[PDB]
mmCIF file of all heavy atoms in Angstrom:
data_model
loop_
_atom_site.group_PDB
_atom_site.id
_atom_site.type_symbol
_atom_site.label_atom_id
_atom_site.label_comp_id
_atom_site.label_asym_id
_atom_site.label_seq_id
_atom_site.Cartn_x
_atom_site.Cartn_y
_atom_site.Cartn_z
ATOM 1 N N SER A 1 -45.549 -0.293 -6.902
ATOM 2 C CA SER A 1 -46.908 -0.012 -7.371
ATOM 3 C C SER A 1 -47.948 -0.190 -6.267
ATOM 4 O O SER A 1 -49.129 0.091 -6.472
ATOM 5 C CB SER A 1 -47.270 -0.928 -8.532
ATOM 6 O OG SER A 1 -47.450 -2.253 -8.072
ATOM 7 N N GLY A 2 -47.504 -0.667 -5.106
ATOM 8 C CA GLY A 2 -48.407 -0.884 -3.991
ATOM 9 C C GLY A 2 -48.915 -2.312 -3.894
ATOM 10 O O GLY A 2 -49.656 -2.646 -2.971
ATOM 11 N N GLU A 3 -48.517 -3.164 -4.832
ATOM 12 C CA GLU A 3 -48.970 -4.550 -4.825
ATOM 13 C C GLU A 3 -48.191 -5.474 -3.892
ATOM 14 O O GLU A 3 -46.960 -5.487 -3.896
ATOM 15 C CB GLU A 3 -48.928 -5.133 -6.243
ATOM 16 C CG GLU A 3 -48.810 -6.653 -6.251
ATOM 17 C CD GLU A 3 -48.882 -7.264 -7.630
ATOM 18 O OE1 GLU A 3 -49.477 -6.639 -8.538
ATOM 19 O OE2 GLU A 3 -48.352 -8.384 -7.797
ATOM 20 N N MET A 4 -48.927 -6.255 -3.104
ATOM 21 C CA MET A 4 -48.340 -7.213 -2.173
ATOM 22 C C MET A 4 -47.885 -8.433 -2.971
ATOM 23 O O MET A 4 -48.701 -9.174 -3.519
ATOM 24 C CB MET A 4 -49.378 -7.630 -1.133
ATOM 25 C CG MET A 4 -49.934 -6.474 -0.327
ATOM 26 S SD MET A 4 -48.672 -5.701 0.703
ATOM 27 C CE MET A 4 -49.058 -6.471 2.321
ATOM 28 N N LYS A 5 -46.579 -8.646 -3.027
ATOM 29 C CA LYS A 5 -46.033 -9.750 -3.796
ATOM 30 C C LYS A 5 -45.479 -10.872 -2.925
ATOM 31 O O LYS A 5 -44.709 -10.631 -2.000
ATOM 32 C CB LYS A 5 -44.938 -9.211 -4.718
ATOM 33 C CG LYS A 5 -44.363 -10.204 -5.706
ATOM 34 C CD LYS A 5 -45.322 -10.489 -6.837
ATOM 35 C CE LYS A 5 -44.611 -11.220 -7.960
ATOM 36 N NZ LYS A 5 -45.539 -11.561 -9.065
ATOM 37 N N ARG A 6 -45.885 -12.101 -3.226
ATOM 38 C CA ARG A 6 -45.417 -13.265 -2.485
ATOM 39 C C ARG A 6 -44.192 -13.805 -3.202
ATOM 40 O O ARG A 6 -44.269 -14.192 -4.362
ATOM 41 C CB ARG A 6 -46.518 -14.325 -2.423
ATOM 42 C CG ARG A 6 -47.575 -14.038 -1.373
ATOM 43 C CD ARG A 6 -48.738 -15.017 -1.446
ATOM 44 N NE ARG A 6 -49.265 -15.338 -0.120
ATOM 45 C CZ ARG A 6 -48.747 -16.263 0.685
ATOM 46 N NH1 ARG A 6 -47.690 -16.968 0.301
ATOM 47 N NH2 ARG A 6 -49.284 -16.482 1.878
ATOM 48 N N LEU A 7 -43.057 -13.828 -2.514
ATOM 49 C CA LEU A 7 -41.827 -14.301 -3.135
ATOM 50 C C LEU A 7 -41.106 -15.361 -2.332
ATOM 51 O O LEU A 7 -41.273 -15.465 -1.119
ATOM 52 C CB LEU A 7 -40.870 -13.131 -3.369
ATOM 53 C CG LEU A 7 -41.265 -12.081 -4.411
ATOM 54 C CD1 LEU A 7 -40.272 -10.927 -4.353
ATOM 55 C CD2 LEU A 7 -41.291 -12.707 -5.802
ATOM 56 N N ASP A 8 -40.301 -16.149 -3.030
ATOM 57 C CA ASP A 8 -39.524 -17.193 -2.396
ATOM 58 C C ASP A 8 -38.534 -16.478 -1.482
ATOM 59 O O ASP A 8 -37.837 -15.557 -1.914
ATOM 60 C CB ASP A 8 -38.764 -17.989 -3.457
ATOM 61 C CG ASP A 8 -37.964 -19.134 -2.870
ATOM 62 O OD1 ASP A 8 -37.355 -18.955 -1.795
ATOM 63 O OD2 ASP A 8 -37.932 -20.215 -3.491
ATOM 64 N N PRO A 9 -38.465 -16.879 -0.202
ATOM 65 C CA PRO A 9 -37.529 -16.229 0.719
ATOM 66 C C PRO A 9 -36.097 -16.315 0.203
ATOM 67 O O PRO A 9 -35.219 -15.560 0.625
ATOM 68 C CB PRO A 9 -37.744 -16.993 2.024
ATOM 69 C CG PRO A 9 -38.232 -18.338 1.566
ATOM 70 C CD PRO A 9 -39.193 -17.965 0.475
ATOM 71 N N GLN A 10 -35.876 -17.229 -0.732
ATOM 72 C CA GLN A 10 -34.561 -17.420 -1.329
ATOM 73 C C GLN A 10 -34.272 -16.376 -2.423
ATOM 74 O O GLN A 10 -33.211 -16.398 -3.050
ATOM 75 C CB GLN A 10 -34.460 -18.840 -1.898
ATOM 76 C CG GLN A 10 -33.098 -19.489 -1.728
ATOM 77 C CD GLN A 10 -32.575 -19.351 -0.309
ATOM 78 O OE1 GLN A 10 -33.323 -19.517 0.657
ATOM 79 N NE2 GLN A 10 -31.285 -19.049 -0.175
ATOM 80 N N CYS A 11 -35.220 -15.467 -2.656
ATOM 81 C CA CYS A 11 -35.036 -14.405 -3.651
ATOM 82 C C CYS A 11 -34.112 -13.319 -3.107
ATOM 83 O O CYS A 11 -34.399 -12.713 -2.075
ATOM 84 C CB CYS A 11 -36.380 -13.775 -4.032
ATOM 85 S SG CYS A 11 -37.269 -14.613 -5.368
ATOM 86 N N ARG A 12 -33.008 -13.071 -3.808
ATOM 87 C CA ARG A 12 -32.035 -12.070 -3.383
ATOM 88 C C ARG A 12 -32.472 -10.631 -3.640
ATOM 89 O O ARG A 12 -33.286 -10.357 -4.521
ATOM 90 C CB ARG A 12 -30.685 -12.332 -4.057
ATOM 91 C CG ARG A 12 -30.026 -13.635 -3.625
ATOM 92 C CD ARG A 12 -28.574 -13.733 -4.089
ATOM 93 N NE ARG A 12 -28.416 -14.320 -5.422
ATOM 94 C CZ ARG A 12 -28.796 -13.743 -6.559
ATOM 95 N NH1 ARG A 12 -29.365 -12.547 -6.546
ATOM 96 N NH2 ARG A 12 -28.605 -14.364 -7.717
ATOM 97 N N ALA A 13 -31.923 -9.707 -2.863
ATOM 98 C CA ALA A 13 -32.272 -8.300 -3.006
ATOM 99 C C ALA A 13 -31.215 -7.399 -2.368
ATOM 100 O O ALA A 13 -30.418 -7.851 -1.548
ATOM 101 C CB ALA A 13 -33.637 -8.047 -2.374
ATOM 102 N N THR A 14 -31.213 -6.127 -2.758
ATOM 103 C CA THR A 14 -30.265 -5.155 -2.227
ATOM 104 C C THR A 14 -30.966 -4.220 -1.250
ATOM 105 O O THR A 14 -32.053 -3.720 -1.530
ATOM 106 C CB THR A 14 -29.647 -4.314 -3.349
ATOM 107 O OG1 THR A 14 -29.044 -5.183 -4.315
ATOM 108 C CG2 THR A 14 -28.591 -3.370 -2.786
ATOM 109 N N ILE A 15 -30.333 -3.980 -0.104
ATOM 110 C CA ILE A 15 -30.896 -3.119 0.928
ATOM 111 C C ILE A 15 -30.823 -1.644 0.558
ATOM 112 O O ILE A 15 -29.829 -1.175 0.009
ATOM 113 C CB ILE A 15 -30.176 -3.347 2.274
ATOM 114 C CG1 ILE A 15 -30.445 -4.776 2.757
ATOM 115 C CG2 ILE A 15 -30.638 -2.326 3.308
ATOM 116 C CD1 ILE A 15 -29.600 -5.194 3.942
ATOM 117 N N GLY A 16 -31.891 -0.918 0.869
ATOM 118 C CA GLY A 16 -31.944 0.501 0.560
ATOM 119 C C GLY A 16 -32.821 0.795 -0.644
ATOM 120 O O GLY A 16 -33.390 -0.117 -1.244
ATOM 121 N N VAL A 17 -32.949 2.070 -0.990
ATOM 122 C CA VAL A 17 -33.747 2.463 -2.145
ATOM 123 C C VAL A 17 -32.806 2.817 -3.287
ATOM 124 O O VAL A 17 -31.653 3.200 -3.061
ATOM 125 C CB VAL A 17 -34.616 3.690 -1.846
ATOM 126 C CG1 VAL A 17 -35.506 3.418 -0.641
ATOM 127 C CG2 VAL A 17 -33.732 4.903 -1.611
ATOM 128 N N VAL A 18 -33.303 2.689 -4.512
ATOM 129 C CA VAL A 18 -32.514 2.984 -5.706
ATOM 130 C C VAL A 18 -32.055 4.441 -5.767
ATOM 131 O O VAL A 18 -32.796 5.353 -5.403
ATOM 132 C CB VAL A 18 -33.328 2.675 -6.982
ATOM 133 C CG1 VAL A 18 -32.489 2.954 -8.223
ATOM 134 C CG2 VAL A 18 -33.791 1.228 -6.960
ATOM 135 N N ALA A 19 -30.833 4.653 -6.239
ATOM 136 C CA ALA A 19 -30.286 6.001 -6.366
ATOM 137 C C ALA A 19 -31.068 6.827 -7.391
ATOM 138 O O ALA A 19 -31.800 6.277 -8.215
ATOM 139 C CB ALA A 19 -28.815 5.924 -6.788
ATOM 140 N N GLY A 20 -30.916 8.148 -7.323
ATOM 141 C CA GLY A 20 -31.573 9.034 -8.267
ATOM 142 C C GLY A 20 -33.011 9.447 -8.023
ATOM 143 O O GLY A 20 -33.654 9.980 -8.927
ATOM 144 N N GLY A 21 -33.524 9.221 -6.819
ATOM 145 C CA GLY A 21 -34.899 9.595 -6.531
ATOM 146 C C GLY A 21 -35.219 11.046 -6.849
ATOM 147 O O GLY A 21 -34.327 11.895 -6.869
ATOM 148 N N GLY A 22 -36.494 11.328 -7.110
ATOM 149 C CA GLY A 22 -36.915 12.682 -7.418
ATOM 150 C C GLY A 22 -36.695 13.138 -8.849
ATOM 151 O O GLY A 22 -37.058 14.257 -9.199
ATOM 152 N N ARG A 23 -36.104 12.275 -9.672
ATOM 153 C CA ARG A 23 -35.827 12.589 -11.075
ATOM 154 C C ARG A 23 -37.057 13.130 -11.795
ATOM 155 O O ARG A 23 -36.967 14.005 -12.655
ATOM 156 C CB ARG A 23 -35.347 11.335 -11.805
ATOM 157 C CG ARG A 23 -35.057 11.544 -13.279
ATOM 158 C CD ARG A 23 -34.782 10.215 -13.941
ATOM 159 N NE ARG A 23 -35.835 9.277 -13.571
ATOM 160 C CZ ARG A 23 -36.008 8.077 -14.108
ATOM 161 N NH1 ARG A 23 -35.191 7.647 -15.062
ATOM 162 N NH2 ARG A 23 -37.009 7.312 -13.692
ATOM 163 N N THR A 24 -38.204 12.590 -11.420
ATOM 164 C CA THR A 24 -39.487 12.949 -11.999
ATOM 165 C C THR A 24 -40.072 14.264 -11.472
ATOM 166 O O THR A 24 -41.008 14.807 -12.051
ATOM 167 C CB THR A 24 -40.463 11.763 -11.765
ATOM 168 O OG1 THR A 24 -40.507 10.961 -12.950
ATOM 169 C CG2 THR A 24 -41.845 12.226 -11.376
ATOM 170 N N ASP A 25 -39.513 14.790 -10.388
ATOM 171 C CA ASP A 25 -40.024 16.030 -9.813
ATOM 172 C C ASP A 25 -39.810 17.274 -10.668
ATOM 173 O O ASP A 25 -40.522 18.262 -10.520
ATOM 174 C CB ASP A 25 -39.410 16.262 -8.434
ATOM 175 C CG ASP A 25 -39.785 15.181 -7.443
ATOM 176 O OD1 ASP A 25 -40.954 14.732 -7.459
ATOM 177 O OD2 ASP A 25 -38.913 14.792 -6.637
ATOM 178 N N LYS A 26 -38.829 17.231 -11.557
ATOM 179 C CA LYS A 26 -38.534 18.372 -12.416
ATOM 180 C C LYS A 26 -39.137 18.187 -13.812
ATOM 181 O O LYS A 26 -38.996 17.123 -14.426
ATOM 182 C CB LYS A 26 -37.019 18.544 -12.525
ATOM 183 C CG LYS A 26 -36.558 19.835 -13.191
ATOM 184 C CD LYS A 26 -35.042 19.821 -13.357
ATOM 185 C CE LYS A 26 -34.501 21.185 -13.748
ATOM 186 N NZ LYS A 26 -33.015 21.168 -13.849
ATOM 187 N N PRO A 27 -39.817 19.218 -14.333
ATOM 188 C CA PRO A 27 -40.423 19.120 -15.664
ATOM 189 C C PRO A 27 -39.398 19.256 -16.791
ATOM 190 O O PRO A 27 -38.382 19.937 -16.635
ATOM 191 C CB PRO A 27 -41.437 20.253 -15.654
ATOM 192 C CG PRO A 27 -40.755 21.293 -14.819
ATOM 193 C CD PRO A 27 -40.212 20.471 -13.668
ATOM 194 N N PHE A 28 -39.653 18.589 -17.916
ATOM 195 C CA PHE A 28 -38.746 18.669 -19.053
ATOM 196 C C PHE A 28 -38.691 20.095 -19.596
ATOM 197 O O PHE A 28 -37.710 20.484 -20.226
ATOM 198 C CB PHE A 28 -39.182 17.720 -20.171
ATOM 199 C CG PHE A 28 -38.961 16.269 -19.860
ATOM 200 C CD1 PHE A 28 -39.981 15.494 -19.323
ATOM 201 C CD2 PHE A 28 -37.744 15.669 -20.138
ATOM 202 C CE1 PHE A 28 -39.790 14.141 -19.074
ATOM 203 C CE2 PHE A 28 -37.543 14.316 -19.888
ATOM 204 C CZ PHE A 28 -38.569 13.552 -19.357
ATOM 205 N N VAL A 29 -39.762 20.852 -19.355
ATOM 206 C CA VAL A 29 -39.873 22.248 -19.781
ATOM 207 C C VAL A 29 -39.948 22.445 -21.290
ATOM 208 O O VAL A 29 -40.826 23.153 -21.787
ATOM 209 C CB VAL A 29 -38.712 23.093 -19.219
ATOM 210 C CG1 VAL A 29 -38.881 24.576 -19.614
ATOM 211 C CG2 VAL A 29 -38.684 22.949 -17.709
ATOM 212 N N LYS A 30 -39.027 21.836 -22.023
ATOM 213 C CA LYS A 30 -39.052 21.966 -23.465
ATOM 214 C C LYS A 30 -38.945 20.647 -24.227
ATOM 215 O O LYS A 30 -38.453 19.640 -23.710
ATOM 216 C CB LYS A 30 -37.969 22.936 -23.926
ATOM 217 C CG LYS A 30 -36.693 22.850 -23.175
ATOM 218 C CD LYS A 30 -35.732 23.937 -23.620
ATOM 219 C CE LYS A 30 -34.446 23.819 -22.830
ATOM 220 N NZ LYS A 30 -33.266 24.221 -23.631
ATOM 221 N N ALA A 31 -39.434 20.668 -25.462
ATOM 222 C CA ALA A 31 -39.419 19.501 -26.325
ATOM 223 C C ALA A 31 -38.004 18.956 -26.462
ATOM 224 O O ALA A 31 -37.786 17.740 -26.406
ATOM 225 C CB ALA A 31 -39.974 19.871 -27.693
ATOM 226 N N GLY A 32 -37.049 19.863 -26.634
ATOM 227 C CA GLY A 32 -35.661 19.468 -26.787
ATOM 228 C C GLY A 32 -35.113 18.579 -25.678
ATOM 229 O O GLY A 32 -34.285 17.703 -25.942
ATOM 230 N N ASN A 33 -35.556 18.800 -24.440
ATOM 231 C CA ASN A 33 -35.081 17.994 -23.321
ATOM 232 C C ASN A 33 -35.696 16.602 -23.404
ATOM 233 O O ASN A 33 -35.034 15.599 -23.122
ATOM 234 C CB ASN A 33 -35.431 18.654 -21.987
ATOM 235 C CG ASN A 33 -34.637 19.929 -21.738
ATOM 236 O OD1 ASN A 33 -33.742 20.275 -22.503
ATOM 237 N ND2 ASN A 33 -34.961 20.626 -20.660
ATOM 238 N N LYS A 34 -36.965 16.535 -23.791
ATOM 239 C CA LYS A 34 -37.626 15.242 -23.949
ATOM 240 C C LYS A 34 -36.866 14.513 -25.047
ATOM 241 O O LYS A 34 -36.529 13.340 -24.929
ATOM 242 C CB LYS A 34 -39.060 15.442 -24.401
ATOM 243 C CG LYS A 34 -40.078 14.859 -23.473
ATOM 244 C CD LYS A 34 -40.125 13.349 -23.534
ATOM 245 C CE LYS A 34 -41.236 12.894 -22.617
ATOM 246 N NZ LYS A 34 -42.519 13.603 -22.944
ATOM 247 N N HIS A 35 -36.603 15.244 -26.121
ATOM 248 C CA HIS A 35 -35.884 14.719 -27.265
ATOM 249 C C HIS A 35 -34.633 13.941 -26.851
ATOM 250 O O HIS A 35 -34.497 12.759 -27.173
ATOM 251 C CB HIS A 35 -35.504 15.875 -28.186
ATOM 252 C CG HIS A 35 -34.596 15.483 -29.302
ATOM 253 N ND1 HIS A 35 -35.062 15.000 -30.503
ATOM 254 C CD2 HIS A 35 -33.245 15.470 -29.388
ATOM 255 C CE1 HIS A 35 -34.037 14.705 -31.283
ATOM 256 N NE2 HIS A 35 -32.923 14.981 -30.630
ATOM 257 N N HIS A 36 -33.718 14.600 -26.138
ATOM 258 C CA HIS A 36 -32.480 13.947 -25.712
ATOM 259 C C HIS A 36 -32.708 12.679 -24.889
ATOM 260 O O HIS A 36 -32.008 11.691 -25.064
ATOM 261 C CB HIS A 36 -31.603 14.935 -24.934
ATOM 262 C CG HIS A 36 -31.192 16.124 -25.741
ATOM 263 N ND1 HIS A 36 -30.455 16.016 -26.902
ATOM 264 C CD2 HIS A 36 -31.448 17.443 -25.581
ATOM 265 C CE1 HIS A 36 -30.276 17.216 -27.422
ATOM 266 N NE2 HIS A 36 -30.868 18.101 -26.640
ATOM 267 N N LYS A 37 -33.684 12.691 -23.995
ATOM 268 C CA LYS A 37 -33.934 11.494 -23.207
ATOM 269 C C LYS A 37 -34.455 10.357 -24.099
ATOM 270 O O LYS A 37 -34.062 9.196 -23.939
ATOM 271 C CB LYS A 37 -34.956 11.760 -22.109
ATOM 272 C CG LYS A 37 -35.205 10.512 -21.271
ATOM 273 C CD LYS A 37 -36.300 10.711 -20.252
ATOM 274 C CE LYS A 37 -36.461 9.472 -19.390
ATOM 275 N NZ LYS A 37 -37.608 9.673 -18.462
ATOM 276 N N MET A 38 -35.340 10.700 -25.035
ATOM 277 C CA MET A 38 -35.919 9.716 -25.933
ATOM 278 C C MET A 38 -34.875 9.062 -26.828
ATOM 279 O O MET A 38 -34.985 7.891 -27.176
ATOM 280 C CB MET A 38 -37.009 10.369 -26.774
ATOM 281 C CG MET A 38 -38.353 9.701 -26.619
ATOM 282 S SD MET A 38 -39.063 9.729 -24.969
ATOM 283 C CE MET A 38 -38.146 8.531 -24.118
ATOM 284 N N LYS A 39 -33.842 9.813 -27.179
ATOM 285 C CA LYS A 39 -32.788 9.273 -28.022
ATOM 286 C C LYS A 39 -32.015 8.172 -27.273
ATOM 287 O O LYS A 39 -31.259 7.410 -27.878
ATOM 288 C CB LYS A 39 -31.855 10.404 -28.461
ATOM 289 C CG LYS A 39 -30.961 10.058 -29.628
ATOM 290 C CD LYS A 39 -30.486 11.315 -30.358
ATOM 291 C CE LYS A 39 -29.654 10.949 -31.600
ATOM 292 N NZ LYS A 39 -29.274 12.136 -32.438
ATOM 293 N N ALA A 40 -32.223 8.072 -25.959
ATOM 294 C CA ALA A 40 -31.543 7.050 -25.163
ATOM 295 C C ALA A 40 -32.469 5.893 -24.790
ATOM 296 O O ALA A 40 -32.156 5.113 -23.894
ATOM 297 C CB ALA A 40 -30.957 7.673 -23.895
ATOM 298 N N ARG A 41 -33.600 5.779 -25.484
ATOM 299 C CA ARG A 41 -34.566 4.722 -25.209
ATOM 300 C C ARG A 41 -35.056 4.042 -26.480
ATOM 301 O O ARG A 41 -34.835 4.531 -27.585
ATOM 302 C CB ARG A 41 -35.781 5.295 -24.473
ATOM 303 C CG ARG A 41 -35.487 5.891 -23.104
ATOM 304 C CD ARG A 41 -35.146 4.817 -22.076
ATOM 305 N NE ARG A 41 -34.942 5.405 -20.752
ATOM 306 C CZ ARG A 41 -33.839 6.042 -20.373
ATOM 307 N NH1 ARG A 41 -32.819 6.171 -21.214
ATOM 308 N NH2 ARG A 41 -33.769 6.577 -19.160
ATOM 309 N N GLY A 42 -35.726 2.908 -26.310
ATOM 310 C CA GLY A 42 -36.274 2.199 -27.451
ATOM 311 C C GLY A 42 -37.683 2.739 -27.640
ATOM 312 O O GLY A 42 -38.660 2.063 -27.324
ATOM 313 N N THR A 43 -37.787 3.966 -28.141
ATOM 314 C CA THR A 43 -39.086 4.603 -28.329
ATOM 315 C C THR A 43 -39.114 5.546 -29.523
ATOM 316 O O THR A 43 -38.160 6.274 -29.776
ATOM 317 C CB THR A 43 -39.461 5.463 -27.108
ATOM 318 O OG1 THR A 43 -39.240 4.720 -25.903
ATOM 319 C CG2 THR A 43 -40.918 5.884 -27.185
ATOM 320 N N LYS A 44 -40.217 5.536 -30.254
ATOM 321 C CA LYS A 44 -40.376 6.446 -31.371
ATOM 322 C C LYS A 44 -41.102 7.650 -30.757
ATOM 323 O O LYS A 44 -42.169 7.500 -30.147
ATOM 324 C CB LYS A 44 -41.215 5.789 -32.472
ATOM 325 C CG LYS A 44 -41.751 6.749 -33.521
ATOM 326 C CD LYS A 44 -40.648 7.430 -34.307
ATOM 327 C CE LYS A 44 -41.236 8.448 -35.279
ATOM 328 N NZ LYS A 44 -40.203 9.139 -36.105
#
């Protein structure tokens, strides 16, 4: 989010960026596609 976070140097982390980047670059195009994704989330 751009926020500077102060953390304990003892905080573990994984090197690299998370897989699947660009997922948001493609539009759902239709309601049906949104539908399927929503069925996999805790959302009405």
Side-chain angles (χ1 to χ4, degrees):
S1 71
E3 156 175 335
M4 301 295 260
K5 186 74 167 178
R6 281 173 144 277
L7 292 173
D8 182 320
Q10 217 48 42
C11 273
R12 294 192 272 69
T14 304
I15 295 170
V17 304
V18 181
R23 179 188 49 171
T24 262
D25 297 320
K26 190 185 192 178
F28 288 95
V29 183
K30 38 185 180 147
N33 291 354
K34 239 287 183 53
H35 172 87
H36 299 300
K37 181 185 183 184
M38 238 62 284
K39 196 157 184 174
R41 297 289 183 282
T43 313
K44 165 63 184 181

